[PDB]
Amino acid sequence: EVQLVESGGGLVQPGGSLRLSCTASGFTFSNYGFHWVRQAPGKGLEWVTIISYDGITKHYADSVKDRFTVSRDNSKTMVYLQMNNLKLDDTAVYYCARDLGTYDDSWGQGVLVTV
Amino acid sequence: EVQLVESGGGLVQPGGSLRLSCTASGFTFSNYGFHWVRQAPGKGLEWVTIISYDGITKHYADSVKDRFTVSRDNSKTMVYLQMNNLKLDDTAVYYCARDLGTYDDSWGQGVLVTVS
Amino acid sequence: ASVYAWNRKRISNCVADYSVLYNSASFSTFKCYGVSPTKLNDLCFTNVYADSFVIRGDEVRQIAPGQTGKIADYNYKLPDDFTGCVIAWNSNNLDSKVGGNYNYLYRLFRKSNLKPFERDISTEIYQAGSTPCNGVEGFNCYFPLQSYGFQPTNGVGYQPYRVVVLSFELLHAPATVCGPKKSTNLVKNKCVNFNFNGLTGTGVLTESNKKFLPFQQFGRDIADTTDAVRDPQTLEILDITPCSFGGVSVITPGTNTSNQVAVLYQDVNCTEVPVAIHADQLTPTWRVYSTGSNVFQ
Amino acid sequence: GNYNYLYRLFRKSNLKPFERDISTEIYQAGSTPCNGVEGFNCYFPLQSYGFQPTNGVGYQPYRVVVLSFELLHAPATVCGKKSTNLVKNKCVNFNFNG
Amino acid sequence: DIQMTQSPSALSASVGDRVTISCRASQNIDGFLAWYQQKPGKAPKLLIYAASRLQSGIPSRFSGSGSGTDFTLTISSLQPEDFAAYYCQQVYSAPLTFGGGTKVEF
Amino acid sequence: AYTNSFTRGVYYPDKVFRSSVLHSTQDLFLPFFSNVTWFHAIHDNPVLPFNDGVYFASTEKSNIIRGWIFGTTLDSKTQSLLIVNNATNVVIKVCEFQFCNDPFLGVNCTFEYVSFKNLREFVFKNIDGYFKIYSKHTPINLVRDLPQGFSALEPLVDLPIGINITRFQTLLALHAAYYVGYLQPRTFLLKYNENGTITDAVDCALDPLSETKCTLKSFTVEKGIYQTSNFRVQPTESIVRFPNITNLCPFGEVFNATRF
């Protein structure tokens, strides 16, 4: 059916650059827009960013914007979220999300990112 | 019509500081970006430097980089090509051209610069 | 022209060759809304408006009916209702130069969204903040228009694109703007479907002895149908004669006496009889014979 | 935007009634042949609707179901009234298969 | 950067004779080239902008042709005014080196 | 000053060619013996109502009259059709201009078009915003008035101006009288020769014999009694009868009621 596997989350020093590559399989990657959702420890879920299916239109949270940049490659089927000037509050288990809030909703196992 | 006139070119000692003036008339100087070109005697033209319409961003030719500077004043409607560490090779007739390589391109009459 | 001050040119009292635009290369998008993209070139319109501007490729996708974008909201607005073709071609070669090109600029900030087919050329400082700008740059105040940056190295997504939007309006008016026809060739002494200057009929066309007055175009018949026509390209009168028609009568002795039959086509010469469009050839189907030797005029 | 819903922007001729075309062949609007690849005045036939929550009501997605009904002397299986005992030899109003 | 050179070693032809000049780039500059004609002791005059479309105020005889690295300019008929140096530059690179150039002559 | 029409100014209604036949047509036409107004320009150019159809008859030895102005306002407020004939070229432009009460010439234009010894006859009709001009030039030996003869005006040009014309004036160079007759919708029986030129016409409403000719469809009428039309008495006045009550219905109370 739909399988999402996230690669690239690891321990980082504050102010470091970390890129998380969400890898898709089992569907046409280009057709569906992708979302990133972080889960801070002992806190509720926090949506990070949404890239569109075309990828020209990218939206971000106010805190997320100017520090986090999202991108995708249709050929490689991977969504890359790039985080810069990382802080201790950034630490969370980010999850790849596809078509949030709709019948096409998918979920990613997630990777723990620690700053 | 667009008229471009050049001045400030004269004989200079090697290593001297010589500054050129690019006159602008008949158009909005501030709106249009400006470029500087030189032609050595019995040689092809050589582009020296460019300056943006606002003057914030500047690029220089690799040979003349760090020795030749360019500045402009929007109020005075003139672009100035400061030349330092001048050499015998540098000797050329300097033509100031606006909006190079486009339909808008115009060419100045030019002023001879000699280094001997 | 710059997108915010888009330039509108009225096209009227001429024949519009849309096909030449179709033939012309480098047109990245040729999308027609409401009007058919092809074969509706002939259709006549009261006026044609050409709106010209230079925008980025993402802005090019933005400029369509019922699309929300910064370029749509604050520069050029397309209504859903209008029937028109939006044409965009890549302009990287001539619209870009070293150090950027300031020639084309767009409006970052406007107080309200632009109404359809409305241009705002105001350069007044945008009052985002509660404090007034006062006509000078201030905190929370920025110039409405931000210059586009066009560079040759700049990627295709950010490359300049030249867009001409054609707007077609139909009203209670002459509709002089139109599209011409190929006009084929004259065929004479053969039954044909003929269109002469929008007048349609089915008949044989022959040379006509009668001479019309110079302004006069067509002859008169009792039905108000044409008895003669003047060709538009060459001012020669052509007589109109109907294609051969008649009743078909089967002369039969009683079925008890015989199954043999004879057929009398009405008011037709026997030369036209072989082309009677009988479904089968050399077999007596529908018609008793067409090539039969027992033929009497 | 939701890319799943698509419509055919370009087709050579108008479709016949109750006819479905699934072809993805490039449309040769330009005089030059497309040759199966994108080119000047050559476009993919199907264009995706841009579907957004904030989108205007005119541009909002609408689910459409078209029902076709056949009136014939055939068995007429799809009846959807309550049957009553047959009455014979006296004049009566009758409904048989509609 | 993209170094511009000129193909013809020499250029002499009489008045009324069709002449041809060529300008090839070192790397692919796409349609980013401008043709020029400079008379002795005169400002250069841009004959063609983008190297395929004629500049305003330039006689119809001058033509722009070529695409990509290759570029050519053709003059239908020569005249005394026509004889001069010619040059080609590429706007596709921020560092700019003009074409060497040749002197069309009578 | 007034003159009779003298059965002049009839025009070809359509581009159809008809031969050796009598055709009845109903369209705006100049009624026979109409008291056409006479304007003198010797030793008088008021704005005149277009009335949908105008017939212009100018008799000029030295071709003093040059053109006409057609517009709803004609004061440059709205687009005013302009025809000016100078030398061999006639210029037709819809752009607004200001004009004098009497034009004297020394001896924004969405549409642009370029082309007493003699009598010049012109018919102007605006239908579906198409300015149609019918022109016939006939030599005249009578200085005084129009000839009592039949001439059929041929269409010169059809303009796609698409603007209303309530009123028209005339521009003439001053160092040639003109006659204006308003067209009225009328049924006319038209005679066509074998060549297709109109030779004569009958105005049906003019007299009872003309009604008989129109009904028979023949210029010649045989002896007999012919039923032509039905006479109707016309109402002298309009009488409106209504209740005298001045009370106003309480629509406002229903519409502006606070709670329905």
PDB file of C-alpha atoms in Angstrom, chain A residues 11-16 38-41 43 67-68 84-94 112-115:
ATOM      1  CA  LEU A  11      22.154  14.022  17.232  1.00  0.00           C
ATOM      2  CA  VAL A  12      23.304  17.531  16.312  1.00  0.00           C
ATOM      3  CA  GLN A  13      25.027  20.409  18.107  1.00  0.00           C
ATOM      4  CA  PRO A  14      23.065  23.704  18.407  1.00  0.00           C
ATOM      5  CA  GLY A  15      23.416  25.824  15.289  1.00  0.00           C
ATOM      6  CA  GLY A  16      24.065  22.744  13.150  1.00  0.00           C
ATOM      7  CA  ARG A  38       7.204  17.089  14.779  1.00  0.00           C
ATOM      8  CA  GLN A  39       6.345  15.565  18.195  1.00  0.00           C
ATOM      9  CA  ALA A  40       8.271  17.299  20.997  1.00  0.00           C
ATOM     10  CA  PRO A  41       8.822  14.940  23.990  1.00  0.00           C
ATOM     11  CA  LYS A  43       4.208  17.642  24.208  1.00  0.00           C
ATOM     12  CA  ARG A  67      15.247  28.525   9.810  1.00  0.00           C
ATOM     13  CA  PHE A  68      13.770  25.470   8.038  1.00  0.00           C
ATOM     14  CA  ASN A  84      19.568  25.334  10.316  1.00  0.00           C
ATOM     15  CA  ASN A  85      20.389  27.287  13.509  1.00  0.00           C
ATOM     16  CA  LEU A  86      18.943  24.370  15.493  1.00  0.00           C
ATOM     17  CA  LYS A  87      17.877  24.929  19.103  1.00  0.00           C
ATOM     18  CA  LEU A  88      17.107  22.739  22.103  1.00  0.00           C
ATOM     19  CA  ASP A  89      13.382  23.473  21.637  1.00  0.00           C
ATOM     20  CA  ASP A  90      13.621  22.059  18.076  1.00  0.00           C
ATOM     21  CA  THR A  91      14.247  18.546  19.536  1.00  0.00           C
ATOM     22  CA  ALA A  92      11.368  16.252  18.545  1.00  0.00           C
ATOM     23  CA  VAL A  93      10.517  13.072  16.656  1.00  0.00           C
ATOM     24  CA  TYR A  94       9.591  14.359  13.209  1.00  0.00           C
ATOM     25  CA  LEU A 112      14.200  11.155  16.658  1.00  0.00           C
ATOM     26  CA  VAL A 113      16.143  14.394  16.166  1.00  0.00           C
ATOM     27  CA  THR A 114      18.043  15.590  19.242  1.00  0.00           C
ATOM     28  CA  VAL A 115      19.788  18.950  19.519  1.00  0.00           C
TER      29      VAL A 115
END
